[PDB]
Design a protein around this ligand. Structure first.
Ligand SMILES: *C(=O)CCCCCCCCCCC
Length: 11
């Protein structure tokens, strides 16, 4: 909804 294709910010 807010983001694109990265939910968990680790990669
Ligand atoms: C917010 O924009 C992050 C991306 C979410 C995608 C969810 C799936 C959207 C399609 C739903 C169809 C019923």
């Amino acid at each position: 909804f807010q983001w694109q294709r990265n939910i968990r910010k680790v990669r």
